[PDB]
Amino acid sequence: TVQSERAFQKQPHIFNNPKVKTSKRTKRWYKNAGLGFKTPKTAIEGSYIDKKCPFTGLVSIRGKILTGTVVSTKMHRTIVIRRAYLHYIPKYNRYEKRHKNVPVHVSPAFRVQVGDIVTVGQCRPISKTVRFNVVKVSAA
Amino acid sequence: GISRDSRHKRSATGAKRAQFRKKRKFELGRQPANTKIGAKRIHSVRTRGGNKKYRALRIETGNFSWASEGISKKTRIAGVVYHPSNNELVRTNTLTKAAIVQIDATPFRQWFEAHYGQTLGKRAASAKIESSVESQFSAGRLYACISSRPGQSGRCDGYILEGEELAFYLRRLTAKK
Amino acid sequence: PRAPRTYSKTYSTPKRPYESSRLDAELKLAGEFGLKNKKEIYRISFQLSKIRRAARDLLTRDEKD
Amino acid sequence: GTYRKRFNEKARSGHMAKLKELKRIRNKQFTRSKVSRLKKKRLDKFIEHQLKREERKTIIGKLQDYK
Amino acid sequence: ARGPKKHLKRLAAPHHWLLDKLSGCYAPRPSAGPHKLRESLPLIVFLRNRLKYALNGREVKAILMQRHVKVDGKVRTDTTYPAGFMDVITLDATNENFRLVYDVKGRFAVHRITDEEASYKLGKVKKVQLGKKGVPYVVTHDGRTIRYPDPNIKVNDTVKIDLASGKITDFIKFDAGKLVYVTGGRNLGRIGTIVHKERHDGGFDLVHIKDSLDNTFVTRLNNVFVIGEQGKPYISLPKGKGIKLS
RNA sequence: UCUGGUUGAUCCUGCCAGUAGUCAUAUGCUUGUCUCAAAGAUUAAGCCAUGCAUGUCUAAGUAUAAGCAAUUUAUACAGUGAAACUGCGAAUGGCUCAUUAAAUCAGUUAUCGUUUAUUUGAUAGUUCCUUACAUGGUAUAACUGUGGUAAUUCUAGAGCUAAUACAUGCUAUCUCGACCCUUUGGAAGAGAUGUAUUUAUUAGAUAUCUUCGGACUGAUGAUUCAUAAUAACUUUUCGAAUCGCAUGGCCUUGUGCUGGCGAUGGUUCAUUCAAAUUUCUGCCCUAUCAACUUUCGAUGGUAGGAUAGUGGCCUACCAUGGUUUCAACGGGUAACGGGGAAUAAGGGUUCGAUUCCGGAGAGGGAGCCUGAGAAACGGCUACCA
RNA sequence: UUACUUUGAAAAAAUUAGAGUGUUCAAAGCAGGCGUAUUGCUCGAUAUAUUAGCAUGGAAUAAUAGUAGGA
């Protein structure tokens, strides 16, 4: 469902006129977030309303583009990915493994299971903790 | 007394941050202006830069537009009907953004009668409009969504709830009654 | 608040101070050259030590470097 | 450090108040004068010994009663 | 710090001013104007420290207030005016024009200039937009706004500007094989031709440039500045012509 | 990092002796010249007498000082100029290192997420629309005068008078063009015509004849972007009632019409000096601190409020999440962070209150006014001391 | 594909390491000088990944992808 909530959901400033009768009963506005990330047809022709989807919402993808391996997919429209790197201890001349967990907002255009590898992009502060936005999935 | 820094919050990990510096004026807040219905009264707060910002304490009238044919008229606001955040706001008759208010019909129906050669209730292809809007006209009051921020611009502007909008809000009102 | 001048010590007491071969060395040097100070001898000793360390490092570099 | 023993706590009154706030809600996790201590300890031992004395005397009385 | 700073220390200055480290504690903080803080030369650092026509700040102020110095045709009386790059400063009582251009070592070199060449000024077209009432305008690299440009003037270009009228005499497109002057980073002052423009979307475009002795370097688009076609610069180049040697 | 000792002479282990420098801190005696230079420390960021450390005027905002200069073209003013109003600065500088352990800060990004005094560059005919523009209006200061109090950079009542303060407010240009004759064109007629504020709507898409002459929107990697258009709305802005030096051009001879150089100001964009938030990675000791955070916002969704603006920032209503043996949370820190300083052959170790950069603070909590910029302390208000 | 390694742009000045110069020497300090100046000449004034990000050349080493079946 789309309208499961106290307010009405719509793309603000997109208006479907009753007096004109058109084929598709609802008008969608969608864009491409550039950087060669092809927009998904599920977003183009879906029915969800997301203020933060990088393809239909009012957020632009700019700055850092990162990669993670999903860990929790288990709150609403946001996921938490894990980035693993190898810190370097110059005194011992060898390495050590580190990670840290980056919350990311995910559009409902994507089906992400735990474990699969995502590419995320930077966007303006979406919530307290989430700055990136899932921009491409890649199954594992 | 209202300040909006993020350093008094728990960290993301749930740690607790000790105070870093004294509170700053470039992150202040101000008291909400509960706009209510009544004779107009509008304070003007002075904002960063030299700018102004017209808090509306009480506002009566408003500018509301009929989207379908694309006109705008100044009307009167009768009272708040529904508000997607606080049924308390509905109780207290507080105008904010995204509210649903009942507005007076007369300017709209007069324009309609004078533009389409036909009365309401009781080129005809163009004159044909929605059943729900016609019913509201017969009653005399329309459902319109306030779509401005009376605490930021001292105004109530709005649009008249058309098809899918109005369907959704009538269901919500009827289900909540 | 101004930019600080650069100073630098011009000598350096040798490693092990009292060593009779070097005591007599300084004696011969001071006597035949009219000096007055183990400090003047140490000044020259420091200058030359710096020079020779420079030269040695260059030698250890490659020819035509 | 955070909770030191300052020179003038009286002049640092409010600083102490907010430090106590910070401390209490950080250690909500866990909670959720030495000679005076010695005097109390020895008072406890002395009163316990006197209790031992009276209980022993009472047991002496009961045993000479039940003999 | 609760507002703009009004002071500049002496160590904190831009290094290319060649300010001694002992004569004082403060350096001329350049007033706001056409060029950025760090890539501008104030009129006192030019009239006293480079030209040696003065000996004091109070002598420099005497010259300016006696109204001798014109920076791009207009008379400037601010003693920390930020004269910048590709600028024309004329001292008429001495009959001199100066194009401010970079020397090979990085520093601003005085470049003596004749009248017919002081008549104009190059500017790096840097923002082309559509102004109010629908007139389009270009914004160059020293603030200058120029309306009604040629439609074929695109960002990152050069426009040769008549100073007497604030107008655009003509322009040069940013294509491979043009001549390029460089204004930032390790290579500034080095003139060469532009070989390749390696363009990254979301990052910084790099440029591969090749100077006359066929020595190649890589800089950023922020730091390239197109001067003229091959072999013919539109301006008169300082001596050495931007060739770094051993 | 080694030197001496044991036994007839030799090798280990050991014992003994033997050593070092430290812008390290204290202190003792001596202290002539020349150049240079620093000048903290009680885990007391503990308390301060007194003086001073922030004011400001050009030809160009306001002078009838009962100020000074006479005197000489100045019977509105005109030189000089105290006082006071107005404008601006006072947010920088200087000082200290208490707090602060992903905080600060360092390198690296973003603003398609925002304010910006100033500087600098651009930029505002709206001709008309039924009943002063040779230029509206009222105040107030200094001043005159009457007074109060132990006392302060305290001030009351009454009388004057100015503005760049305050409050008001008025004065054709183009599209087509039948016709005319053709050039150098002129022409009946048809029509169009501010900005700012708020909302809604729309656009901003783009896989043959011949007189040889002529006729058949942008930017980005990406946008609801720039920009334009429609209908309305607004306790509503702006669209020059200001000032200096000059005195030219014209004539219907009116004290008529025109006009030069530059001061100040003003809307909207651009720039500059800034600012606020933010991406990536990196901190010392502690596991004899193993679970942490969630009522009292902890993680996320939606709507609103608030803000210069993003956002649990805050409030509602929802879900029940978030961090953690890759060490979270807690405790300690004689912890401001970095550039740098000392020193070792390397590897490392220790120092960095302290000449530059950043941050934070002005006895301790909190709070606010002005302003482009302050949660300011040589500003204000109350509370503790 | 990545780790990793090469080259590159980036890492403020001062400090450090160097070059030049008879501050009377020195500690230091600092950036042109000759000419027929009407068109010329001379020199020296460089270096300092120690991680994160960015672009780039890689063949090894350590991880990580990816032939078959029927008629």
UniProtKB/Swiss-Prot annotation, chain B:
Modified residue annotations for Phosphoserine: S65, S68, S72, S85, S131, S132, S135, S138
Tree of life domain: Eukaryota
Annotated segments matching region Disordered: 1-30
Entry-linked PROSITE patterns: RIBOSOMAL_S8E
UniProt keyword terms in alphabetical order: Cytoplasm, Phosphoprotein, Ribonucleoprotein, Ribosomal protein
Protein task: Component of the ribosome, a large ribonucleoprotein complex responsible for the synthesis of proteins in the cell. The small ribosomal subunit (SSU) binds messenger RNAs (mRNAs) and translates the encoded message by selecting cognate aminoacyl-transfer RNA (tRNA) molecules. The large subunit (LSU) contains the ribosomal catalytic site termed the peptidyl transferase center (PTC), which catalyzes the formation of peptide bonds, thereby polymerizing the amino acids delivered by tRNAs into a polypeptide chain.
Keyword Oxidoreductase applies: no
PANTHER family, sorted: 40S RIBOSOMAL PROTEIN S8 (PTHR10394)
Organism from which the protein derives: Saccharomyces cerevisiae (strain ATCC 204508 / S288c) (Baker's yeast)
UniProt-listed Gene3D superfamilies: 3.10.290.70, Ribosomal protein S8e, subdomain (1.10.168.20)
Note: Present with 15900 molecules/cell in log phase SD medium. There are 2 genes for eS8 in yeast.
CDD domains listed in its UniProt record: Ribosomal_S8e_like (cd11380)
Gene Ontology molecular function, alphabetical: structural constituent of ribosome
GO cellular component assignments: 90S preribosome; cytosol; cytosolic small ribosomal subunit
Protein name: Small ribosomal subunit protein eS8A
Location of this chain's protein in the cell: Cytoplasm
Family statement: Belongs to the eukaryotic ribosomal protein eS8 family.
GO-annotated biological processes: maturation of SSU-rRNA from tricistronic rRNA transcript (SSU-rRNA, 5.8S rRNA, LSU-rRNA); translation
Modified residues (Phosphothreonine): T61, T106
UniProtKB/Swiss-Prot annotation, chain C:
Coiled-coil boundaries: none
Organism domain of life: Eukaryota
Location of this chain's protein in the cell: Cytoplasm; Nucleus, Nucleolus
Miscellaneous notes: Present with 106000 molecules/cell in log phase SD medium. There are 2 genes for uS4 in yeast.
Record note on quaternary structure: Component of the small ribosomal subunit (SSU). Mature yeast ribosomes consist of a small (40S) and a large (60S) subunit. The 40S small subunit contains 1 molecule of ribosomal RNA (18S rRNA) and 33 different proteins (encoded by 57 genes). The large 60S subunit contains 3 rRNA molecules (25S, 5.8S and 5S rRNA) and 46 different proteins (encoded by 81 genes). Interacts with snoRNA U3. uS11 interacts with MPP10. Component of the ribosomal small subunit (SSU) processome composed of at least 40 protein subunits and snoRNA U3.
Family listed: Belongs to the universal ribosomal protein uS4 family.
Functional description taken from the UniProt entry: Component of the ribosome, a large ribonucleoprotein complex responsible for the synthesis of proteins in the cell. The small ribosomal subunit (SSU) binds messenger RNAs (mRNAs) and translates the encoded message by selecting cognate aminoacyl-transfer RNA (tRNA) molecules. The large subunit (LSU) contains the ribosomal catalytic site termed the peptidyl transferase center (PTC), which catalyzes the formation of peptide bonds, thereby polymerizing the amino acids delivered by tRNAs into a polypeptide chain.
Curated annotation (Swiss-Prot), chain D:
Annotated compartments: Nucleus, Nucleolus
Note: Present with 2000 molecules/cell in log phase SD medium.
Role: Probable ATP-binding RNA helicase. Required for 18S rRNA synthesis. May play a role in restructuring of the pre-rRNA.
UniProt-recorded name of the protein: Probable ATP-dependent RNA helicase DHR1
Family: Belongs to the DEAD box helicase family. DEAH subfamily.
Species of the source: Saccharomyces cerevisiae (strain ATCC 204508 / S288c)
This protein's encoding gene: ECM16
Subunit-level organization: Interacts with snoRNA U3. Component of the ribosomal small subunit (SSU) processome composed of at least 40 protein subunits and snoRNA U3.
Basic and acidic residues: bias regions: 6-24
Domain of life: Eukaryota
Swiss-Prot record, chain E:
Coiled coil: none
Residue ranges constituting the S4 RNA-binding domain according to the UniProt record: 41-104
Encoding gene per record: RPS4A
Other remarks in the entry: Present with 573 molecules/cell in log phase SD medium. There are 2 genes for eS4 in yeast.
Keywords of this entry: Cytoplasm, Isopeptide bond, Phosphoprotein, Ribonucleoprotein, Ribosomal protein, RNA-binding, rRNA-binding, Ubl conjugation
Phosphothreonine: residues bearing it: T114
Locations listed in the record: Cytoplasm
Family: Belongs to the eukaryotic ribosomal protein eS4 family.
Name this protein carries in UniProt: Small ribosomal subunit protein eS4A
Modified residues annotated as Phosphoserine in this record: S31, S246
Subunit architecture: Component of the small ribosomal subunit (SSU). Mature yeast ribosomes consist of a small (40S) and a large (60S) subunit. The 40S small subunit contains 1 molecule of ribosomal RNA (18S rRNA) and 33 different proteins (encoded by 57 genes). The large 60S subunit contains 3 rRNA molecules (25S, 5.8S and 5S rRNA) and 46 different proteins (encoded by 81 genes).
Lineage top rank: taxon: Eukaryota
One matching Pfam family: Ribosomal_S4e
GO CC annotation: 90S preribosome; cytoplasm; cytosol; cytosolic small ribosomal subunit
Main localization category: cytoplasm
GO MF annotation terms: RNA binding; rRNA binding; structural constituent of ribosome
HAMAP family cross-referenced by the UniProt entry: Ribosomal_eS4 (MF_00485)
Alphabetized PANTHER family for the sequence: 30S/40S RIBOSOMAL PROTEIN S4, SMALL RIBOSOMAL SUBUNIT PROTEIN ES4
SMART domains tied to this protein: S4
Biological process (GO), any one: translation
Linked residues for Glycyl lysine isopeptide (Lys-Gly) (interchain with G-Cter in ubiquitin): K61, K133, K160, K167, K173, K178, K210, K232
Taxonomy of the source species: Eukaryota, Fungi, Dikarya, Ascomycota, Saccharomycotina
InterPro entries membership: KOW, Rib_uL2_dom2, Ribosomal_eS4, Ribosomal_eS4_C, Ribosomal_eS4_central_region, Ribosomal_eS4_central_sf, Ribosomal_eS4_KOW, Ribosomal_eS4_N
